[PDB]
Design an enzyme around this catalytic site. Sequence first.
Site, PDB file in Angstrom:
ATOM      1  N   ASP A   1      15.931   7.365  -2.174  1.00  0.00           N
ATOM      2  CA  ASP A   1      14.992   6.470  -1.433  1.00  0.00           C
ATOM      3  C   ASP A   1      15.350   5.014  -0.885  1.00  0.00           C
ATOM      4  OD1 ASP A   1      13.358   6.237   0.503  1.00  0.00           O
ATOM      5  OD2 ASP A   1      11.665   6.155  -0.682  1.00  0.00           O
TER       6      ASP A   1
ATOM      7  N   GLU B   1       9.927  -8.036   0.176  1.00  0.00           N
ATOM      8  CA  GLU B   1      11.043  -6.855   0.420  1.00  0.00           C
ATOM      9  C   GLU B   1      12.232  -7.497   1.165  1.00  0.00           C
ATOM     10  OE1 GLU B   1       8.539  -4.486   2.738  1.00  0.00           O
ATOM     11  OE2 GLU B   1       7.412  -3.879   1.289  1.00  0.00           O
TER      12      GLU B   1
ATOM     13  N   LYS C   1      16.377   1.829   0.809  1.00  0.00           N
ATOM     14  CA  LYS C   1      15.986   1.387   2.000  1.00  0.00           C
ATOM     15  C   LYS C   1      15.558  -0.149   1.810  1.00  0.00           C
ATOM     16  CE  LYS C   1      11.338   3.158   1.803  1.00  0.00           C
ATOM     17  NZ  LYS C   1      10.485   4.316   2.330  1.00  0.00           N
ATOM     18  N   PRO C   2      15.633  -1.024   2.913  1.00  0.00           N
ATOM     19  CA  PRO C   2      15.286  -2.475   2.708  1.00  0.00           C
ATOM     20  C   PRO C   2      13.851  -2.563   2.137  1.00  0.00           C
ATOM     21  CG  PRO C   2      16.385  -2.184   4.709  1.00  0.00           C
ATOM     22  CD  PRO C   2      15.834  -0.641   4.249  1.00  0.00           C
ATOM     23  N   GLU C   3      12.756  -1.515   2.466  1.00  0.00           N
ATOM     24  CA  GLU C   3      11.487  -1.588   2.247  1.00  0.00           C
ATOM     25  C   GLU C   3      11.342  -1.645   0.357  1.00  0.00           C
ATOM     26  OE1 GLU C   3      12.583  -0.563   4.745  1.00  0.00           O
ATOM     27  OE2 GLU C   3      11.032   0.487   6.089  1.00  0.00           O
TER      28      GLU C   3
ATOM     29  N   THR D   1       0.744  -1.113   0.052  1.00  0.00           N
ATOM     30  CA  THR D   1      -0.059   0.022  -0.054  1.00  0.00           C
ATOM     31  C   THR D   1       0.724   1.195   0.073  1.00  0.00           C
ATOM     32  OG1 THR D   1      -1.965   0.972   0.893  1.00  0.00           O
ATOM     33  CG2 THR D   1      -0.229   0.328   2.477  1.00  0.00           C
ATOM     34  N   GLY D   2       0.163   2.299  -0.265  1.00  0.00           N
ATOM     35  CA  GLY D   2       0.904   3.653  -0.364  1.00  0.00           C
ATOM     36  C   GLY D   2       0.103   4.838  -0.370  1.00  0.00           C
TER      37      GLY D   2
ATOM     38  N   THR E   1      13.675   8.834   3.328  1.00  0.00           N
ATOM     39  CA  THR E   1      13.255   8.102   4.528  1.00  0.00           C
ATOM     40  C   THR E   1      13.811   8.536   5.579  1.00  0.00           C
ATOM     41  OG1 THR E   1      12.086   6.276   3.390  1.00  0.00           O
ATOM     42  CG2 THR E   1      12.481   5.789   5.590  1.00  0.00           C
TER      43      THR E   1
ATOM     44  N   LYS F   1       1.321  -0.941 -10.338  1.00  0.00           N
ATOM     45  CA  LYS F   1       1.264   0.131  -9.218  1.00  0.00           C
ATOM     46  C   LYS F   1       0.139   1.047  -9.796  1.00  0.00           C
ATOM     47  CE  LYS F   1       4.646   3.133  -7.546  1.00  0.00           C
ATOM     48  NZ  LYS F   1       6.224   2.889  -7.355  1.00  0.00           N
TER      49      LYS F   1
HETATM   50  N1  LIG Z   1       7.743  -5.052  -8.733  1.00  0.00           N
HETATM   51  C1  LIG Z   1       7.043  -5.372  -7.651  1.00  0.00           C
HETATM   52  N2  LIG Z   1       7.126  -6.964  -7.310  1.00  0.00           N
HETATM   53  C2  LIG Z   1       6.500  -7.147  -6.185  1.00  0.00           C
HETATM   54  N3  LIG Z   1       6.120  -6.214  -5.317  1.00  0.00           N
HETATM   55  C3  LIG Z   1       6.085  -4.935  -5.488  1.00  0.00           C
HETATM   56  C4  LIG Z   1       6.893  -4.458  -6.547  1.00  0.00           C
HETATM   57  N4  LIG Z   1       6.835  -3.350  -6.757  1.00  0.00           N
HETATM   58  C5  LIG Z   1       6.220  -2.802  -5.513  1.00  0.00           C
HETATM   59  N5  LIG Z   1       5.827  -4.062  -4.714  1.00  0.00           N
HETATM   60  C6  LIG Z   1       5.336  -3.725  -3.552  1.00  0.00           C
HETATM   61  O1  LIG Z   1       4.567  -2.512  -3.112  1.00  0.00           O
HETATM   62  C7  LIG Z   1       5.366  -1.946  -2.266  1.00  0.00           C
HETATM   63  C8  LIG Z   1       5.305  -0.457  -2.221  1.00  0.00           C
HETATM   64  O2  LIG Z   1       5.800   0.002  -3.243  1.00  0.00           O
HETATM   65  P1  LIG Z   1       6.405   1.330  -3.766  1.00  0.00           P
HETATM   66  O3  LIG Z   1       7.394   1.717  -2.693  1.00  0.00           O
HETATM   67  O4  LIG Z   1       6.824   1.355  -5.002  1.00  0.00           O
HETATM   68  O5  LIG Z   1       5.226   1.951  -3.340  1.00  0.00           O
HETATM   69  P2  LIG Z   1       4.896   3.298  -2.894  1.00  0.00           P
HETATM   70  O6  LIG Z   1       3.453   3.364  -2.204  1.00  0.00           O
HETATM   71  O7  LIG Z   1       5.355   4.438  -3.637  1.00  0.00           O
HETATM   72  O8  LIG Z   1       6.099   3.302  -1.639  1.00  0.00           O
HETATM   73  P3  LIG Z   1       6.545   4.765  -0.901  1.00  0.00           P
HETATM   74  O9  LIG Z   1       5.787   4.934   0.343  1.00  0.00           O
HETATM   75  O10 LIG Z   1       8.118   4.273  -0.643  1.00  0.00           O
HETATM   76  O11 LIG Z   1       6.481   5.876  -1.661  1.00  0.00           O
HETATM   77  C9  LIG Z   1       6.612  -2.623  -2.286  1.00  0.00           C
HETATM   78  O12 LIG Z   1       7.119  -2.522  -0.966  1.00  0.00           O
HETATM   79  C10 LIG Z   1       6.522  -4.168  -2.671  1.00  0.00           C
HETATM   80  O13 LIG Z   1       5.772  -4.706  -1.581  1.00  0.00           O
HETATM   81 MG   LIG Z   2       7.422   5.340  -3.362  1.00  0.00          MG
HETATM   82 MG   LIG Z   3       8.531   2.547  -1.386  1.00  0.00          MG
END
Ligand SMILES: Nc1ncnc2c1ncn2[C@@H]1O[C@H](COP(=O)(O)OP(=O)(O)OP(=O)(O)O)[C@@H](O)[C@H]1O
Ligand SMILES: [Mg+2]
Ligand SMILES: [Mg+2]
Lengths: 339, 20
Positions: free
Chosen positions: A155, A116, A157-159, A40-41, A190, A61
């Site tokens: 950015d 992750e 990080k392990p996440e 999620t995000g 982060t 995404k």
């Molecule tokens: N290519 C992928 N394959 C599998 N899972 C993925 C992939 N891309 C993203 N994810 C899952 O989605 C999560 C969030 O992705 P991402 O960081 O891109 O989103 P975000 O919501 O923009 O995060 P942030 O808060 O860093 O902005 C990742 O941790 C992973 O769990």
């Molecule tokens: Mg992001």
């Molecule tokens: Mg992220």
Amino acid sequence: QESVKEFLAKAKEDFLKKWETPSQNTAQLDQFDRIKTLGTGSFGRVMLVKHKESGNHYAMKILDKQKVVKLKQIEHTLNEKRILQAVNFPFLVKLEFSFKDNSNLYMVMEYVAGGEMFSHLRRIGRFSEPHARFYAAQIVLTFEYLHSLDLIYRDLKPENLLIDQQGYIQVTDFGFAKRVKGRTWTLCGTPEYLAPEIILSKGYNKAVDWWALGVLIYEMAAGYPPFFADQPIQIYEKIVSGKVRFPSHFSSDLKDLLRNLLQVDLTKRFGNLKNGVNDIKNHKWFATTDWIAIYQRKVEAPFIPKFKGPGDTSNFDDYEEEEIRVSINEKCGKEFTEF
Amino acid sequence: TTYADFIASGRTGRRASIHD
Ligand SMILES: Nc1ncnc2c1ncn2[C@@H]1O[C@H](COP(=O)(O)OP(=O)(O)OP(=O)(O)O)[C@@H](O)[C@H]1O
Ligand SMILES: [Mg+2]
Ligand SMILES: [Mg+2]
């Protein structure tokens, strides 16, 4: 090294051609079976999907255009897509398709089932130094590639580090990525990973990525970050303090590499010097590392996630699962015209 | 121990990105 600058020279050409004229509208929403939310995000979610005609699984995404506009992340989002469709590297997650509809932006990326690095790191507790150096090496090669294209990542990080089936890293989340020659001033990243010059609002360069590498390597080997607290402000205070303490089990090499990376002075930070990345590659900590076999992914990974089917999500936490509506009216047309 | 202090802290989970 000789085929290195040759490699990066050809890579810059491939990149700049895609940078100059980015791909657009290479799929659409009905071609995919939406199955489960992997993450999620702020802007929306990251769903696991299956390509109807291909059978392949991807990570789609989804970005709510209105939320992007509301958080003033328009330009950052345009950066992320344009950079992602243009770059190509063994340790970077790959953008298969991008498109948009009336309500949302879509980025369809190859699915990385291993989850992750964060999850495995927290469960295991910490990586031994040989384990952390297999990962760090991939990031070193990746930053060398990206920075040569004048791209700054901002950015790490392990996440945001996914593990593929062969135990290697795929870097994800280019939300703060930006092609820039010179200084930039955006406060982003982060907290535990912010370089001092970011926090102090000084204006910064690609050296903030190498700092972030130090923080990453520390967290992977210590099991916890070099600067943690309950509130980000108190984290920033420890970062700008310039004081770091290493666990007793840290090797002398590892400590020396990290003081060089977590160097507050940009004139003494590794990766930001005359010899650039090779200061890091030729460090004693990395003396065991074959940079070429790493790139070629000929090494043997110290950990390979349990595989159990193409659309398996056991390496991902579960999330609540929201509607997905598409407004009958086009939202934010002008802003995302180039996406 | 530092590990114990970490595990008891509020930021052991996945950490959100920031921007402002
Ligand atoms: N290519 C992928 N394959 C599998 N899972 C993925 C992939 N891309 C993203 N994810 C899952 O989605 C999560 C969030 O992705 P991402 O960081 O891109 O989103 P975000 O919501 O923009 O995060 P942030 O808060 O860093 O902005 C990742 O941790 C992973 O769990
Ligand atoms: Mg992001
Ligand atoms: Mg992220």
